[PDB]
Structure 1
């Protein structure tokens, strides 16, 4: 049988993988579910076509190298990689992953979560994040659609395309000026689990800052005592005073312990923001916290070359090399 086509994208993954169905997409690719006739289960297949852009080639190599090294229950892995037999023919790379049922984005569109579920989901996000940060890696795009879920409420973090050694979930430092950006994102996700709506839904950069200030209040002098973009600093100083809104006013029915943790994750100053181990140890997560059952990385991850300097043609070679061991006859 020929290759299958899904929403205009051809998927050349047969004969092992067939009966394909759309399940997601990104800047330079598409994800489908597919039947694996070897393991006799359905899998996820992520198609990416990065080779025309140096940045996308960088991201592709990082994502593959990081996910091939990582091993953790709350982190998506790589089971297989398909690409053409020669580098001149390789225009696409197919990354095969465990198939999950849904994501937190879809869940929050349709279901009201109980405190217990919120607690358990938050715990697994942070358990996975502890492993990532222990490897000295930042995810940088945590958000509900990148948190995958099973029938049995198991949670896995996916999409490590932006990982290194989305506006609504973007930490203020990023816009004004480290691991703390991931904590901010988790805080945004916690808030969204509590209310089923994004806490800071800005329409653009300035609007994002305005929503954050609308809740946290005007930043203090120490909050601004840092290296900071001149334009952003002048903008913030041009604004009238904004009062802080108490968390319990915004989330009237929330567990007070959840709101205490939320306060510490959504702290404006990254240096005062709670870190992942301290968050796991917060009273809100007491029911699930189990440091004897929370694996960390054996060593910190680092790249041998640095890829930012490499031409995209050289990056392609490295990707071709990295993926070779999944080829038949290897």
Structure 2
């Protein structure tokens, strides 16, 4: 049951709440709708409150926006919530598992990813779950970052934690520091993902397909090779450092080897993005200004945010209030 009033008609399943494609009789165009009703499960409401707030605040060409939201007129009657967004032709995930991207395509995709990330980060926000399935693409290959479900506000000061700390974000694109002593409250956590995403656009397959928590880590050290003495020193947590030391030595696999068909500049940037020590990992602005993206880099055309961005009763009430602007009057 997809009850989205009269304005939106001609429904049809799209993916998995439930996402469908409807025609906007008011905009003479088609759009996508996402049905959400996790209210029962508190462990699924704050994620809806976060994204809505972050997505309405954000305004960027490379970031998906909310064109409209649907819900009951009263908090009592409000059950399901319908978020409406622009309908894209596909995503990086489906494209990677069927198409071969040319160097020019990779360059453009990388640029659009970083351009929007720059805005996200400029608003002191971390995406934390960037990956192909979260990058929508239209027929002309324009890219848009989506799903700020796990996004948070940067909090570098309180990013340290013990060894083997549970993490939600997709395993394959998790930064090595996450399985060691990082809680994921630093902007470098997003650059690492963009990194993994680059490698994937090069060989059409995830770079570090870990099978489990540690498998992700041992899969990373496989290419980068054992972390240097300096990088380890940075790590203070005894449990974490001793694990890296217990591990056998691993040589570094040369990028020009994993992707001999890649572009040297791109590989040079891939190197900066996939750095074991987060503190030395390149920044988004430094990535946009990298020689690889030289034909696109334009700081004046790369907007930044204008300013830095619960019981089972408040979340519903809060979400209800955050969705009022889309109600008549």
Taking structure 1 as the reference length, what is the TM-score of the superposition? 0.89
What residue in structure 2 maps to residue 285 of structure 1?
293
The Cα shift of 1:311 comes to: 1.8
Deviations 1:242-276 (A, max 9, x none): 11111111111111000000000000111000000
- Superimposed CA distance per residue, residues 250-306 of structure 1 (whole angstroms, 9 cap, x where no aligned partner): 111111000000000000111000000000000000011111211111111xxxxxx
Query: Which is worse superposed, 189-198 or 229-238?
Result: 229-238
Q: How far apart are residue 222 of structure 1 and its match? A: 2.6
- Structure 2 Cα separation of the partners of residues 238 and 89 of structure 1: 58
Match of 1:245 among 241, 253, 260: 253
For 1:93 and 1:118, locate their aligned partners in 2 and report how far apart those are by CA, in whole Å: 36
- Residues 1:267 and 1:90: Cα distance change in structure 2 (over 3 Å): same
How far apart, in 2, do the equivalents of 1:224 and 1:15 lie?
Answer: 60
**1:163 Cα shift?**
1.4
5+ residue gaps, structure 2, are 153-168
CA distance in 1: counterparts of 2:236 and 2:69, whole angstroms: 42
Q: Which runs of 5+ in 1 are unaligned?
A: 1-9, 301-309
Q: CA deviation at 1:106?
A: 0.9
Secondary structure of the 1:324 match is coil
SS of residue matched to 1:326 = coil
Residues 67-82 of structure 1: pairs in structure 2 closer than 5 A: 67-82=55-70
Say if 2:288 and 2:297, in contact at 8 Å, map to a contact too.
yes
Q: Is the 8 A contact 2:21 2:30 kept in 1?
A: yes
How far is the alpha carbon of 1:87 from its aligned partner?
2.0
* 1:166-210 per-position Cα deviation (integer Å, ceiling 9, x unaligned): 111111122212111110000000000011010000111111111
What is the CA deviation profile of residues 20-52 of structure 1, one whole-angstrom value per residue up to 9, with x for unaligned ones?
223332xxx122111111111111111222323
- Equivalent residues of 1:57, 1:312 under 8 A apart: no
Q: Structure 1: how far apart are the matches of 2:196 and 2:90?
A: 20
Aligned partners of 1:311 and 1:225: how far apart in 2? 42
Change (3 A) 1:13 1:229: farther
Distance in 2, matches of 1:209 and 1:60, equals: 30
Task: Return the offset for 1:228.
Answer: 6.2
Hey, which bits of structure 1, 4+ residues long, moved more than 6 A?
none
Equivalent residues of 1:188, 1:266 under 8 A apart: yes
Q: Aligned in 2, Cα 1:31/1:233: closer, same or farther, shift over 3 Å?
A: farther
C-alpha separation in 2, matches of 1:34 and 1:68:
21
SS in 2 for 1:325: coil
> Of 6, 12, 17, which residue of structure 1 is paired with 2:8?
17
C-alpha distance 201-228 of structure 1, shift in aligned 2 (>3 A): farther
How big is the shift at 1:231?
Answer: 5.0
Counterpart CA distance in 1 for 2:15 and 2:190 is: 22
Contact persistence 2:226–2:252 (CA under 8 A) = yes
Whether the aligned pair in 1 keeps the contact of 2:209 and 2:219 (CA below 8 Å) is yes
Contact 2:235 2:241 in 1 (8 A): no
SS at match of 2:287: helix
- CA distance 1:316–1:227, change in 2 (3 Å): farther
Say if 1:237 and 1:312 are closer, same or farther in 2 by CA, change over 3 A: farther
Change (3 A) 1:33 1:217: same
- Cα 1:201–1:83, aligned 2, differ >3 Å: closer, same or farther? same
DSSP-derived class of the 2:268 partner: helix
Work out whether 1:49 is the aligned partner of 2:37. yes
What is the distance in 2 between the residues matched to 1:76 and 1:228? Answer: 39
- Report if aligned partners of 1:176, 1:228 keep a CA contact under 8 Å in 2: no
1:234 positional shift: 4.0
Indicate the RMSD between aligned Cα atoms, in angstroms.
1.8
Q: How many residue pairs get matched?
A: 308
CA apart distance, 1:86: 2.5
Q: TM-score, normalised by structure 2?
A: 0.89
Instruction: Say if 2:118 and 2:304, in contact at 8 Å, map to a contact too.
Output: yes
Distance 2:313 2:176 in 1: 35
